[PDB]
Subunit: 140 residues, 6 copies
């Protein structure tokens, strides 16, 4: 079932993300296997999504990461994430890892990141916080 | 009443924030003047808060901004932030401004930032997004 | 966006439904485009899903329709469906149409059923109730 | 207390059900003895309740069973039924038994059905599913 | 329908209230005619209900009014009473009228009190607050 | 942390209570240290707060105690108080103690009342109910 939700997350990113280079999605799943929240990378709701705003490097001033978006969207909708799992198409960055912990998510399910030395430091900080704060990491 | 909640936010930061240099808090207030969520700057819940982890520059690897924390805490608790106002002791950074929009908060109430040219760019991006996405900014 | 959610519904049915002949799913979507509930056709939760129980005609004694399941699952989870839309891979039967009305769903989005005279009566009753009770039907 | 709620269910059916032959009601009660949801047999909300539509056999095209209605009404209102008990004036049919399981109700309290051979098969299927899926049946 | 709910309230009081002299109940009904909360007069939950504690005048040290109980029970269960109506077997006392206003209830439905000069002052204060604060009073 | 919330309660009363003699506030805090509800002593919402209505003895006809207000406000907002703690600037009166029990609050945190023989009876009844019903009292 974890793999089926991961497959759905991949499809979500392909269908909904407007990023022209890299589409990312995350599903927050509760203990009854209900989809509590969905995030995908994008610009803020209602912000005019011009071609110029989605080019690099300009898009980084406006874009929201998928996992951050899943959490912020749950706050908007008033959906409780404490105890849930997050199934994401990309292992979280350092800042999203903090928000994952703060939202009460207890488990991250994703694929193993490709070896990239520029991300080793960030990856190490995320896993240090996850290990200490009780967040399980499961790689498909 | 906005000023009374801002006063309470200042007291919240002084009482609860462990940052040795700068304490920050934010109250998310609904349309019935109920406190929907509180954030303050800090390390993730349960992360060992050693002296070394709170020193600069190391603390930036672990710290969560107050306004981000208010939103992530609402997602943990399942509290609906759509339509609420956020009363904060510090005008939000560019990334927290994105999360504020995504959480459905409609209004930011704070004090006017001091002139700081290193923050002009960030301040301009936050206000560009707020203006376009319908977030009112009110300075006390 | 309606077509993207319909595509996801089709994928949901293919991934999760255990019916060996016909897989059905339905997504209940709220006015902020959040997935409030998912249903797919299946046997009751925890009921032993033997090969014999999934054969015809025996499976009809135990199977739950996808749209009924979406509504019953929302009641289990305490998710409010009033005002939502249901995007389904199959136009609802007469009994599911009643439950759709009772759950407060205001709109059915699906594909146009193929001409089948054995279902004309049922289809006519569903649309009579939908028309009178204020449920919009939209065909992709 | 179970008998007092059953008495109230009987009164609910007599007061609210428009069926001219048989009035049915069900109360879904949580573990704090709060009434989470009420169902009674009837036509869909807002459907014109003409004399012709309530005659037999025409009414079966439009009527909703009380226990199904209790569950669909909870989905409309966003009331969590997981772990609740359902106190009903009539033992559930095969289809309502499926929905009871799917809604997370853990216990059915009613009176013992009168001997009726035409319902033996249905009664046997309901109890087979209840026994296997963990639903307790208590007869007053 | 208001009269049918009032009839149910009377039955609730007769079935559940342990007061040996006067049994009182109140139903808080939302705009979809769902029973949001029930109160009846009684001693606090789990307090040993001895014969001595239910005698007069001792019982007044421990008893909770039905309408107060309906509101406190909703707070325990987390049920939103804003905009609801309260259907009560007895017109509220001065203190319960305050709590009714504070809970967001917008309408009181009951029977007309019998002429009792010892209650004229209290009745006048309740209606002064109701009139000014926007609470409609409807007598059956 | 209990003392920090008590300090905030004192500030809440000073900022928001309009009583010219004695300002009272109470914070209901959940097990994640989120502020579930706030009460302070005052007149009903929207009632014209004239100088005459706030004088003694007239104000007692209209005023609501802080702890009662915290509970009634939670019912208005639909916030679950079961299992929470109430941190109050004043030990509850006999009637508020009943409502505290009925709302599911499990713990009262306040300062020790000053010796006042006119309140001994009331204080004794509150503590008798708290002891029997499982409410812990903690004095700072
Ligand atoms: C609906 C939805 C949006 N989001 C995020 C993605 C984007 O950053 C932002 C808005 O999504 P968009 O798909 O951009 O939607 P929009 O409301 O901006 O409308 P439009 O199609 O006209 O652009 O919110 C989620 O993370 N989860 C959701 O379920
Ligand atoms: C309780 C609470 C915490 N937070 C944030 C602040 C911190 O970053 C984090 C945890 O707060 P801390 O005060 O650090 O609490 P803790 O659970 O880590 O316990 P301890 O006192 O032993 O350290 O969550 C909020 O933003 N709002 C809240 O209401
Ligand atoms: C999780 C889930 C289940 N259902 C329905 C489908 C089935 O009829 C029933 C249970 O789904 P199943 O996929 O059968 O899951 P299960 O809990 O029975 O476990 P197992 O995999 O061991 O069989 O609930 C939904 O409609 N929506 C949902 O989101
Ligand atoms: C209010 C309510 C309705 N129902 C069901 C019964 C019916 O099938 C349907 C609507 O109930 P009805 O009593 O028919 O109410 P209505 O909204 O159709 O209005 P009218 O009196 O003009 O007919 O919903 C419940 O199961 N539980 C409830 O609490
Ligand atoms: C269940 C319930 C209780 N109450 C009130 C009535 C009483 O004052 C108090 C508890 O109700 P009681 O009927 O006394 O129940 P209890 O939990 O004390 O158990 P026992 O039967 O052993 O005495 O809560 C409501 O107002 N509404 C409700 O829905
Ligand atoms: C907002 C709020 C009010 N209350 C109580 C205090 C008062 O008795 C009542 C209303 O509070 P007031 O501060 O009087 O507010 P109001 O809505 O009457 O507006 P105004 O300032 O014009 O008078 O509700 C709480 O207990 N908690 C809360 O969080
Ligand atoms: C690194 C990272 C990027 N993203 C988003 C930001 C951008 O929209 C996109 C990456 O764009 P890029 O591949 O052109 O650099 O993916 C996430 O959602 N999460 C992450 O962890
Ligand atoms: C800039 C900024 C900092 N903070 C936090 C991060 C740090 O804990 C602290 C600033 O530390 P510093 O003053 O030593 O740089 O304030 C916020 O919460 N929000 C903000 O917008
Ligand atoms: C007709 C219908 C069937 N179904 C389910 C029941 C069965 O599991 C399956 C149909 O099986 P069949 O194609 O072998 O008859 O689809 C629905 O979920 N909704 C419907 O409206
Ligand atoms: C068999 C059954 C019927 N009903 C309803 C449907 C009809 O409105 C009524 C039975 O009508 P009848 O007695 O004329 O056949 O009771 C239920 O609510 N639940 C059941 O389990
Ligand atoms: C006056 C009043 C009494 N009651 C309760 C308190 C007692 O249990 C009972 C009255 O008892 P009595 O008739 O012996 O005086 O009714 C309410 O619930 N609401 C009210 O408004
Ligand atoms: C005794 C008591 C008073 N109060 C309020 C009622 C009045 O507004 C105020 C007391 O006014 P006083 O000090 O002039 O008598 O405090 C509470 O909120 N809780 C209590 O337990
Ligand atoms: Mg957009
Ligand atoms: Mg900490
Ligand atoms: Mg199964
Ligand atoms: Mg009707
Ligand atoms: Mg009792
Ligand atoms: Mg006022
Ligand atoms: Zn990230
Ligand atoms: Zn920030
Ligand atoms: Zn169907
Ligand atoms: Zn049935
Ligand atoms: Zn009263
Ligand atoms: Zn009091």
């Amino acid at each position: 079932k974890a793999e089926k939700f991961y497959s759905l997350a991949c499809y979500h990113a392909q269908l909904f993300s407007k990023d022209p280079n890299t589409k990312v999605a995350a599903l927050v799943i509760d203990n009854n296997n209900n989809i509590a929240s969905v995030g995908y990378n994008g610009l803020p709701r209602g912000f005019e999504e011009t071609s110029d705003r989605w080019e690099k490097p300009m898009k980084y001033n406006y874009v929201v990461h998928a996992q951050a978006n899943a959490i912020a969207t749950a706050a908007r909708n008033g959906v409780r994430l404490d105890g849930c799992s997050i199934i994401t198409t990309l292992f979280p960055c350092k800042e999203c890892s903090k928000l994952i912990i703060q939202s009460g998510i207890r488990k991250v399910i994703t694929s193993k990141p490709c070896k990239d030395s520029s991300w080793l430091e960030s990856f190490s900080f995320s896993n240090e916080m996850f290990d200490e704060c009780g967040i399980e990491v499961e790689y498909l």
